[PDB]
């Protein structure tokens, strides 16, 4: 199917405790493959997946050079933005950057992304045309015409449509035993009596990749989203993911309910019932 590559940067200013902490993570779909922690001892981009370990030292040197150089720019921007809002030099502040590209099954450009945040809220983002900018407040418009005068959009678009997509293709093939595999969810149902007039049925979905999944409940073939509970999809710690959904049902009527599991690793959507 379609695939994504994302890079997440986070720079946290810590006044009185050194220079800002910079953390960079690289993702292909739902799989991290590189990371940079400026508080780690290597000061180099480190692999996080087996397939990227085969890249040569020229790869790891350029990746280390580029993102540490981004961390240096984040340091200056941290002081700049703090001045934009006239904020104290001892308060903590965070700059977050997200960017990446999407490709189709044929493996070429679908969409491109570039969004920047300050203190957890939108600052400036690259629009979908990859030629204009959308600013949240007036302080971010100062950055907008700065990036308009410097023509940052042209060179962001050049990477989003070029080097991003091209290397996403290489990663998808070099690690297809992991990235392009579709582990279907191993499912089951549990029953927990609440009282003697109500009971909880939980629909489990374990060990699936990618994380995208849909768990829904039905009663007599009719959708039931009242008295339901869905938890956030969570990592299992081994590359796969977990999720469950619950419904409170009257005692005796447990078999009127059905759980439905949709996932790209499944040929047909599964249906499970409590016997």
């Amino acid at each position: 199917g379609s695939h994504s590559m994302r890079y997440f940067y986070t720079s946290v200013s810590r006044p009185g405790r050194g220079e800002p902490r910079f953390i960079a993570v690289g993702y292909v779909d739902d799989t991290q493959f590189v990371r940079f922690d400026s508080d780690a001892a290597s000061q180099r981009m480190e692999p996080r997946a087996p397939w990227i370990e085969q890249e040569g030292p020229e790869y790891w040197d350029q990746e280390t050079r580029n993102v540490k150089a981004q961390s240096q720019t984040d340091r200056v921007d941290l002081g700049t933005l703090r001045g934009y809002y006239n904020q104290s030099e001892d308060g903590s502040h965070t700059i977050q950057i997200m960017y990446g590209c999407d490709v189709g099954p044929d493996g070429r450009f679908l969409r491109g992304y570039r969004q920047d945040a300050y203190d957890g809220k939108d600052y400036i983002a690259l629009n979908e045309d990859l030629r204009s900018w959308t600013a949240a407040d007036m302080a971010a418009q100062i950055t907008k015409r700065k990036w308009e005068a410097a023509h940052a959009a042209e060179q962001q678009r050049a990477y989003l449509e070029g080097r991003c997509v091209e290397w996403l293709r290489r990663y998808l093939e070099n690690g297809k035993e992991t990235l392009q595999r579709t582990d279907p969810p191993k499912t089951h149902m549990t029953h927990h009596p609440i009282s003697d007039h109500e009971a909880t049925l939980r629909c489990w979905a374990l060990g699936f990749y990618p994380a995208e999944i849909t768990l829904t409940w039905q009663r007599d073939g009719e959708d039931q989203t009242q008295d339901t509970e869905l938890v956030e999809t969570r990592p299992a710690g081994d590359g796969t993911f977990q999720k469950w959904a619950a419904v409170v049902v009257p005692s005796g009527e447990e078999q009127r309910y059905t759980c439905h599991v949709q996932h790209e690793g499944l040929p047909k959507p599964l249906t499970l019932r409590w016997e």
Partner: peptide
């Protein structure tokens, strides 16, 4: 690979 385009200041 991460964006090789070099960062314009904010």
């Amino acid at each position: 690979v991460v964006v090789g385009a070099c960062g314009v200041g904010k």
